[PDB]
Amino acid sequence: HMNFKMEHQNKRSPLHAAAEAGHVDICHMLVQAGANIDTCSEDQRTPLMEAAENNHLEAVKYLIKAGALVDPKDAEGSTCLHLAAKKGHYEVVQYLLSNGQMDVNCQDDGGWTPMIWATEYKHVDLVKLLLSKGSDINIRDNEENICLHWAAFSGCVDIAEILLAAKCDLHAVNIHGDSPLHIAARENRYDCVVLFLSRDSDVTLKNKEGETPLQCASLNSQVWSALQMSKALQDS
16 A cells, blocks of 8 residues: 655554564565554554564564664653563564664663663563663662662562673662662561671661661561661671
8 A cells, every 4th residue: 555654644554563563574575565564552662672572573674774764762661672671582682682783771760771671571681681782770760779789679580680791789778768778677687688798788777758778668578587687697
């Protein structure tokens, strides 16, 4: 059929559906027939984003090795790189990093980077990959949290361990004055408060509320019991 030439189209196109299904040929036919490889859906999404988020590697390569615009931002500031990471698609994130020449520290609207996203969904090897290829662990989301704070909030020690082995500040604090240990206590993440204590995290540090990590844990929690055993062994 015919593709009207448009300035800013705000309507989903067949390319999106094809992209989202990962059908490489239909994509080709459409592109070859005039389809704008970068059209935006009503919710501001590019076919590349559709193909990325749905783990369709070959269709991601095609769109890319065909002019696909790559730093389009979501309606909430996410790029295809965020989306693929958020879903933990290793290969897509890989290609988007190497052959796609994209920015690993791109931050969406909430301040989050792909690593904070892969941390939120506990995609270990994706955090490894993002580190191995340039992640700046000092990035601070809009509320002063650096990746470690969320590794803490989440509870995944393997991601928390990995971020520390990357020279990440164990005492960095967000807009509330909370440190990673403060968080790992409130959310009752035992294994985490243990790794943290094992790396000398100040149990006496108060936040902007006056609370210390020990004062943030719930009473008689596994975490409370650990944090106190600690404060006592410190006072001794």
